[model samples]
Target: GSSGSSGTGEKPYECSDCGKSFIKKSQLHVHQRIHTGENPSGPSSG
Candidate 1:
């Protein structure tokens, strides 16, 4: 609703945390982790 790729008509899920957008909710969920502090992939991958 604020900011996102908006490059084309693909990514729909908009990150309410960062205002970013993603193709899927999971993608957005994963991306939201960056702002929250939740780690579904070991907090941080190498």
Candidate 2:
């Protein structure tokens, strides 16, 4: 058996834009959106 996890004392996902660390990559990615000023809402389509 093998451990398929990061398995470390430090955060595996660290934001490149801001030296911030998150336990999971999901949060890190969402955090990046803030710096990028990305709109979470869908675009207006008609």
Candidate 3:
């Protein structure tokens, strides 16, 4: 016997501030930084 799950065209998580939808919670967590003006690459200091 084989088990399989069907994919739904729905998003579970969403950013409250920007209203961006995310399929996974982890992706939403990382996307929140854009609202805070945080650099995704690295810190630029002089």
Candidate 4:
């Protein structure tokens, strides 16, 4: 497990699809959509 930091100077994961970096893998997964222009918001019919 990794610990969270608020130093404002750390990037843990980089999205392969877009070049966007995130502090966590979860955030990277969500940011990957910037390349495909996909909506990472939520399910429309759930």
Candidate 5:
């Protein structure tokens, strides 16, 4: 009975920081900031 019509919502982007998943790779990059302690502004000491 392995017949079900379900559209695949694949989350190919997986985070190494906490085993999290994201639909887009860009989203994963943002999520990594939480663990890396990176500023959203980036390269700005002010």
Candidate 6:
């Protein structure tokens, strides 16, 4: 299952507010929603 934080844990994306690390870009995008409070449209909708 390619759930959240998939791939090689590259964690290339970092949250500017919390500086949290995520493995994939999509995961990071999704995480952005937490700070932006924006609805997810799909993929990197955050």
1-46 per-residue lDDT for model 4 (tens digits):
7776556765668665444678777887766655555454444211
For 1-46, candidate 6 gives per-residue lDDT tens digits of 6668555644668766567887689998888777775554456433
Q: Which ranges of candidate 1 are over 4 A from the true structure?
A: 1-6, 38-46
- Candidate 5: the clashing residue pairs are none
Lowest lDDT block of 10, candidate 1: 37-46
Give the Å shift of residue 27 in candidate 4.
Answer: 0.8
* Steric clash pairs (candidate 4): none
Decide which is better by TM-score, 3 or 5.
5
What lDDT would each prediction earn against the true structure?
A: 0.66, 0.68, 0.68, 0.60, 0.68, 0.68
Shift in Å, residue 18, candidate 1: 1.9
Question: CA lDDT of 26 in candidate 2?
Answer: 90
Model 3 ranges off by over 4 Å: 1-10, 37-46
Candidate 5, residue 14: the lDDT equals 71
Encode model 1's per-residue lDDT on 1-46: one tens digit a residue. Answer: 6986447665588765545777778888778778765543543443
Per residue, candidate 5 scores C-alpha lDDT tens digits across 1-46 of: 8987565775677766566778887898888778675543443233
Candidate 4: 10-residue stretch with minimal lDDT: 37-46
| Full-model lDDT, candidate 4 | 0.60
